[PDB]
Amino acid sequence: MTVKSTLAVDMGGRYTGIFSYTTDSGFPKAKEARAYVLNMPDNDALTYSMAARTQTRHRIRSQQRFVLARRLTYILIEGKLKRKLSPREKEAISSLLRRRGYSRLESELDLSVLQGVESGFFKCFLPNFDEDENLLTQWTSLTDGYLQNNSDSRRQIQIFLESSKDSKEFLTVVKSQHQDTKEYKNALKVMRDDAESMIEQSMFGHKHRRLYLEAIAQDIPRDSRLKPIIEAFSGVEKFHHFIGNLSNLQLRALRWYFNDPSMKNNVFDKERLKSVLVRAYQFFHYPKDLTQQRAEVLNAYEGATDILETLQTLNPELTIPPYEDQNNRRPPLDQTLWLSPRLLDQRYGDTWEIWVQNLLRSPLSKGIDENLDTILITTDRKARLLERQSGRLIHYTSQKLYHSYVLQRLLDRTVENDAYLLKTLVSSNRGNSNEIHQAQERLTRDLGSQHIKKFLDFVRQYYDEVDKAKRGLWFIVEKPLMERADIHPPMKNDSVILRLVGNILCVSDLVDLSFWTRKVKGQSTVRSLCTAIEKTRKEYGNSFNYLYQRALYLQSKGKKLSAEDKDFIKLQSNVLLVSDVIAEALDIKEEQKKKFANPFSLAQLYNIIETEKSGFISTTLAAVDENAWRNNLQGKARCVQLCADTVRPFDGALRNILDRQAYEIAKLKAEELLSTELKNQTIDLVVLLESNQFAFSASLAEVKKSANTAAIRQKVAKAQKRQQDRWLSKDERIKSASRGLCPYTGKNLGDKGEVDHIIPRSLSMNYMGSILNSEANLIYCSQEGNQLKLNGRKKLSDLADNYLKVVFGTADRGTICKYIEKSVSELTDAKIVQFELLDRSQQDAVRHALFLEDFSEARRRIIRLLGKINTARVNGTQAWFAKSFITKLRELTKEWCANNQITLAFDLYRLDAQTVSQDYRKKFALINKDWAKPDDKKQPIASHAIDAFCVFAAAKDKRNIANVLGVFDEVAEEQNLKTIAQLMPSEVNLISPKRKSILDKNEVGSRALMKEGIFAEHFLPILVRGDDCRIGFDWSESGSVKVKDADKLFGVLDGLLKQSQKRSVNGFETYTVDRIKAFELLHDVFIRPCSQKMLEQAEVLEKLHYITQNISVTSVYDAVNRQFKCREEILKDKDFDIKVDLGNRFGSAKGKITLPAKREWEKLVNRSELKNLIKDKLSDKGSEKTPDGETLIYDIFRSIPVQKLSHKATRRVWSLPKIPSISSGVRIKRKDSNGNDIYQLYMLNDTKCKGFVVNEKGVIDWSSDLVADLYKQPTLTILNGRYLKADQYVRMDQWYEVDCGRDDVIVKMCPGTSGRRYIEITQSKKQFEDWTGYISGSFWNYPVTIKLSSQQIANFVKNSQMPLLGKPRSGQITVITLGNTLKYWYCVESKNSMMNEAYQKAYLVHFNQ
RNA sequence: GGGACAGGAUGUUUCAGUUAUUCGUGAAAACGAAUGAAGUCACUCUUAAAGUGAGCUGAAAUCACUAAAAAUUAAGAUUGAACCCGGCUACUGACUCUGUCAUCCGGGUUUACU
Structure with a gap:
């Protein structure tokens, strides 16, 4: 009846492993479970970032x-x-x-490196700078002044550049006044390069609008x-x-x-x-x-x-526009969640207002509306904003807002202040205690007993919604009583920041920020110390608190400080000093110092004061005031802070990647659900399980390429190494817990021991939230001791006497029990839970406390503390991916939920990658040995499905996770075997997303149609002396090709040829192709069915047609290898030869013409400046290694011109024409400023052909190009294109199962491309290993893309013994399914006749029916 | 982190011009200016004109449908962005701070709408 579905996700970044199933029963069967991995193509194959798109947009905007x-x-x-x-x-x-x-010319180099340096350090080199202003503003102003031709800036740039050449003095002065070389190094290698870029920008053509106006003041009278x-x-x-x-x-x-x-x-x-x-x-x-x-x-x-x-x-200097400021371009939306009077009205009508009124008439409800007079005047939600814009308030009147605010305040009262024990009186786990009865008697009296049940149901719903919101999953409520603010908060405003700082510094009203510049221990300042604290926190990320606490605790214990803990304790001293200085500046007292005397508060002060000068505050002022009241720094703790939704990711490209991943996974889940028969009733519950690591960030640094691969890799390597040092081989267990003695036998144990839980896995099902795969519940034991362990309750009577003596020094069970109780009672919960914050004696005391009696105080306290260790809230990235997936899965199955009536119920749980990989994956790796994590410098694709399966296996956190892996009577290795040997399928379905095909896009304009770069399209001249006529440029043998029977050639081209105007005295005749008429005819033969005469004319025009493009003369030198290129590499015949192939039908002209621009390239390489540098042959090159030959190549051409005009443009690139490679040319007809028709030739960016033509009897025409309908425009002409009537055609993606002629192999084929077919082979893994020479450690180690080398390709074609399979294109194979049955597809290297025949037979079989 | 605005400069292609001339000058030491800029090199053909190619100079065009403007170089199952119009009843921002303007809000989005 209650059908359960589960979807475990290992968010590995590029590869996303999915393990999903859907079962009527609690535990899934073998066939129901499926494994998937998303391949997630990089930014080249699927665009996520918009940088290139906006570069194109702004180029077109400048042109317009x-x-x-x-x-x-x-x-x-x-x-x-x-x-x-x-x-x-x-x-x-x-x-x-x-x-x-220009008017702004901000910059072109990344100056974020120097943004973390205080401006006071640069006053030695920049006396114009001041310490009261940030370095960002001062450097930006100085650069702008140099760009705006400020004389002082122009002089001081040169002063710096000359003074900084002698860097030895700069390195000598440093460290004399407690300076830092690491931070002061930023005065070089970035800012010097920026200054040099400003120096070189003048000669590139950049002149600023004022100098442009000065230049055009001249050249106006001169023209x-x-x-x-x-x-x-x-x-x-x-x-x-x-x-x-x-x-x-x-x-x-x-x-x-x-x-x-x-x-x-x-x-x-x-x-x-x-x-x-x-x-x-x-x-x-x-x-x-x-x-x-x-x-x-x-x-x-x-x-x-x-x-x-x-x-x-009006003077044009006044009309130069200021700098753009798109600070209000898209303000952030407040994420605060508010109890909605509107939704309360739609749900309970009026009764909630009477509930509020009844609760108000009670002495327990005094003081809950202290500041509602000045809070309700500010709009807080989007709905209230809409009502006020309408000017009429029906759901958000002041009375309704008052009632909602006091209702939420009553519902959010802390346990110290809650007079009715809400969230306890409403929970099902409530007892029959006298305090619960007293709380319920306080209720039912203030509210009244006539509507207690409805109010209690509302309280239940509200607390469930608030619990969802705290976890970061407010979106799955799908029937909220709260609402998001969804309105813009104010900016910093220089006065809102004062309120924020006063809230941080526990000051009711702050008037000035003079404390930010107060001196600390000399010339250090509060600002610099807070900056350093925030820099350290940013570098250490979310791990900063752990090592900070560890370092302070170890210093308190007097251990030996490390190179990092020394910095951490220095930071602690800095926090203490800054807190004292802030207190003395603000004369604050009465234990308000310690509230902000932590690195977090000082970093927050630095962020509020310094970072994001033009940024926005987090929430609206109404939410800030309400949260300040629910903090009550003048009081103790009244009320809990407001819930807030998770903000969307800032990266955008990451947001797009998550959106696409969520869509793909939701589509997989929708296919899984729709495949089922499920019918009337049968509510469906879907549970989501997620895992995440730093590998996610590392791989997303390559999916979008991040433009910062090296820096991000360096940053994430530190975090990954720190995580490895945090987990290690789980030290302090073998060396500290056992101390060389088995806990249960006392025998000498070396490295052969094993780690197993102390508490039986069965008992952690009826109480407490986890099996506790922690440092205390598991001890390094021996195999014999683990066999003697069994699955019952274990006590100190089973501990070895010698082991107990080694650990404690006493073998008496009662003495050890009382010592354990004393040691555990002496440690607070913070030290008990965090095992690192305990020395080995207290660690042993806490670990051994689990062996005590069930009634023991120490054991009960430890179980209570570790049963609710953490809430496991989702990361913002995880929250966004979850929201997108849930929304898309709801959308996809909306039709499947309307009919058959299935109602989807969603739950979500985050599982730590640490516990999953370090505990659950190891067990299955021991079981099967194909589940082991490889160390091949990469994480192999299919093992992400293994990770997702382990994430599902880590759902042993029962009584909390409700995927109905319950009952749980069979535990220990029995459950592990039942999981692995019955659940994890052999098949791994690799999903490789890709961008939509341009043949399918209805908005073809959202795809780059033509490649940037225009090509010159030329026609060979026709020379006639008399009966002698030649095709070419000049009468030389290499410059033209002789034409036999030229009368036929001139008859074909009678209307397309034009003659030279200046007639010579018997100096032959030159006939050149009329460009406009030729292009018009070439368009006509492409867009209309033309007559045979026009087709012959087009053929002759194309035979006379050739394409060149100017390529920079710099190309004569290899910049990558710093080596000049040889004449063989430069003057190769491929770039200068024109083939003339006119048949007998068009006269007779067979031969090759060299491009006359080769003479200009020969002149370039044979000139004095480059004669010696260019070697005559490839084999002559050696180790000359010219470092900057491009400079001298430029100086050949950059001749100083005559200053005839002040507004003349500069020259930077010199080039000569070469014949380029042609690939799907397109000729575009546009108009100049005068309205004439101009033709420019481009290269197509996407696919040209949409399929192959199919005649009335199903025969596929494999030779004719069927151009897509988007290129058949009146202004577009496909190069060498012809009109083709195709009423019926077969698409490039119409896959058909071809007659393979075998039973072990399933082969599917589609046309794929205009030249090469696509072949998909379903084959056994062993057979694929036999055909190719490929070898790997089972299919779990197989890559998604298989790169067969040439020998492997030959082995494939040979041992295959199958002509219709061909060979993979460059030996590239894309895997679709992994397992014993291996499914993969590839593009064939070359076209084959029987491949087309097989596809034709399959298409005919499908076409007859 | 990203996103957007504003563009700057150079390329490529198309078209056109240019292979000069007149002055200082009458030495024509080969330069300096003017002619709006350019105006110098090759192969072929020499009749000794020219043809061809390159260079240089100037402008124009530099995704198509497609145009007055916008959208158009992302994705598409969904979207996001952009732009325009109306408004300051009101979330946000800048002002000269009831008074406009907007990147804000509402709507529209293809030859739409004002």
Whole structure:
């Protein structure tokens, strides 16, 4: 009836192992369980980050900015001239508008390395700096001043660069005044490089808008094409001001002006332009120093009478836009969860208000509304915001909000303050104690007994929802009584931070932050110490508290400090000093120091004061005030803080990866559930189990590539090594617990011993939350002792006398019992639970206390403490993945839940990867030895399914996890065997996601259609002397190919050839292909069924057609190897030979023409500057290793030009044409500024063909290219493309099972690609090992991608004895299923006839029916 | 961490021009300026014009449908983002701080809407 389903997930990052099942009974059967692994392709195969997409968007936006600025400038100039602009005038105006220069030019290098250094250290090299300001602002201002041509900055940059050359003095001065070389090293290797980048930016062409305006102040009188325009503008200065004001416009202003379908005619509107110019410069946030410049521009534009005269009059330097500030671009949403009066009204109508009123009339409910007069005035939720925006309050009136706030305060009262023992009176585990009866008598009297049951049910639901919220899984409530705030909080505001600090420093009202600059132990300052504390916490992550407590405890015990614990105790001293200094600055007293006298509070102070100057606070001020009241620093502890939802991940790319992983896993689970017959009634419960590690971060640093692989690997290696040192081989058990003696036999035990639980695994089912795979419940024992252990209650009578004497020094059971009781009673719960914080004597005392009587105080206390060790809340990444998976699984099965009525019930539990891997995986590894974790420097794919299975196996935490692995009478190795030998399937289904095929996307524009880079498309000239005619460039043998029967050639190309205008005196005739007509005909033959004449013309045009592209002359030198390339590598015939293959039908011209640009490449390599550097042959190269040959190659070409014009552009790349590789060319027809048709050739980025044509009788045409419908546009022309009528076709992904001719092998085939078929083989694992030479340690070690080497490919094709299988493309095989039956698919290396015949036979079989 | 805005500069391709000229000058020591910029090198053909290729200079175009603007180089099962319009009844931000503007809120999103 109660059908149970489970889905265990090992979130390994790239590889996500899933073990899932769905059973009517409590324990799953063998067939029900399935194992999956997600392959999760990297960013290249599936895009998660948007960096390239936005780079493309902003490139197009810059192009459109220039186009619209030119459009508006032409409109205005033609309006003032009352006549159309000539093409020369248009060219001159465009020349003026080109190369605006920058206005911000922030940076191009990552300066985050130096962001953690205080500004006071650089005053030796930068006297202009001050210690009262952060280094970020000062360095940014200095760089901007150098960019904005600030004379002082320009001078001090050179002063620094000259002074810092002698770095020996810089290294000598350091350490004299308690400086740090590690932090002061940042003055080199990043900031010096940034300064040099600023030096070199000037000669690249970057000039800034002010220098651009200065340059275009000149070159306006010098350009003779602008004379009529200058005359009509009545002055060079007026026209310059007009041009500069127009150029200063951003894209958005031009868009606003042209955002009108009536602007298609390019009409000049005075008022529209004025309003658009006013709308700009009002969009901007002007700095305080740039005030009264915003005022000037806005007075000019708003007060403009003619706007055009205002453009000609206003100084363009004033109209340069300020820096962009998208701080309010998407404010964070408050995550605070509020008891909703609206939902309370929909659920209980009015009765909850009477509940609140009845509870209020009680002396126990005095003081619960202390600050509700000043809290309710601030909107806290999205629903209240919507109601107030409507102006009418029906569910969020002040009275309703008051009632909800006091209701939640009563429900959230602490146990010291709860007068009705809520969350205990409502729990099922409540006893019949006198205190429970007194609490229930206090209730039913204040509230009244007429509606006790409904209020109690509401309390039950509220506490269940709050428990879900605390765990991080508020989303699975699916019927909430609370609501998320979902509204933006205020920013720092310089005054909200004062309130936050006062809350942190336990001050009711803080007025100033002078304590942040108070001196500590000399010239150290509170700010620097808090910065160092936060830096240490950030470096150590979530592990900081553990080693901090360990170091302080070991220092208290007087142990020998380590190199790290020394730093930690120095940090402790820093915390003490900073707390004392803060207290004396704020004169605070009465035990308020110790509240913030921890590294966490000082790091929080640093974050609030320093980090995120323009950031947002966590929650709304209403939530902050309510939480402050429920903290009550002036009081003890009244009420518990408000629940808050888990914020979405900040990474976005990680968010997309989690979204796709959740969708794939939800689709797997939906397939599993829909495969079942389950019918009327039969509620379904799904339980989620998750595991996580630092390997998740390490692998996601490669899935998106993170752009920081080295740094992230270095950071995560430290954490992983620390975790390994935390778990080790579980030291302090063999060496400290047993002390060389078996606990139960006393025999000498070496490294052959084993570790097993003290408490029987059966007893940890009826009480206490875990089997306690901890350092106390397990002891290093011997095999004979473990056999004598059995599964009953164990006591000190079974402990060896010699072992007891070694551990304690006394063999008396009563004496040892009383000593254990005394030792356990002397240690607090914090030291008891955290085993590292105990020395070996107390560790033995705590461990041995489990052998005592059931009534023993020490044993009972230890069991009580360790039964509720932690809540195991989910990580934010885990919470987001869980939310996405649950939402998508609900969506997928929504139809399957409407019909058949199954209602989905979701539960979720996080399981530590530590316990799973270190305890549960080891048992199965011993059982089967294929479950052992490899150490091959990588974690093999299929073993993530093993990890997920162990995560399910780690669900022995019973009485808590409700997947109905209950009863649990059979324990110890019996349960392990029942798990492994019956549950874990042999098959591992590898799921490899991929981006949607462009043939399936309806929004083909969301995919990169064409590759960036345009190719020159050329036609061979035709030379005619008389009866002699040649195809080529010149009459030389290598420059042209002789044509036999040229009359046929000229008859075919009668309408496509044009002749040279300047006629020579018998100096032959040159016939060149008309580019426009040729391109039009090549488009016509591609887009329409053309006549045979047009097809012949297109064939001849394509035979005369060739493609070149300019490649930089730098390519003559190998930068990677710092070696110049030889003439054989440079002048290879592949890059310069044009093949002419006209058949008898088109005259007769067979031969190869060398590209005449080869002479220009020969001139490049044979010139004096490079004659010796270029070697004549590949074998001549040696160890010359020219380090910077690119520099001299540049200096060949960077000749200083004549300064004719100040606005001339710079030259940086010099290139010569070479014949490139062609792959699915596309020719795009566009229009220039004059409206003429221009054709530019691109390379297709995605697939070109959508399938193969199928005739009326099912025969597949394997030779014709069936171009996709998205390329068949009136402006698109597929290179060498022809029209093809295909009313019926077979898609590239129509897999069919072909006639393999065998029984042991199942082969499926699909067309796959236009040239190579896809073959999927279902085969036994042993047979695959026999065919190929591949070897591995069972299929659990098999990789998802198998890279067969050439010998293995030959072995495959040979031992296969199967011509239709072919060979894998470059020996690459993608595995679909792992196990004894191995399923995999591959792309064939080469096309084969019988492969096409087999697919054709399968398609015919499917097509006849 | 990411996301977005603003772009800057150089490339590639298309088209066009250019292989000059006039002055200082009459030495024509080979340079300096002007002609808006460019204006110098090869193969072929020489009739001694030119053809071809490159360079240089200028502009234009640089995903398509597709255009006034936007969306368009992500994903798609779902979405996210972007942009525009209306509003300051109100979450947020900047101001000149009841008064506008917005990256905010609501809506729309393809030739839509104002």
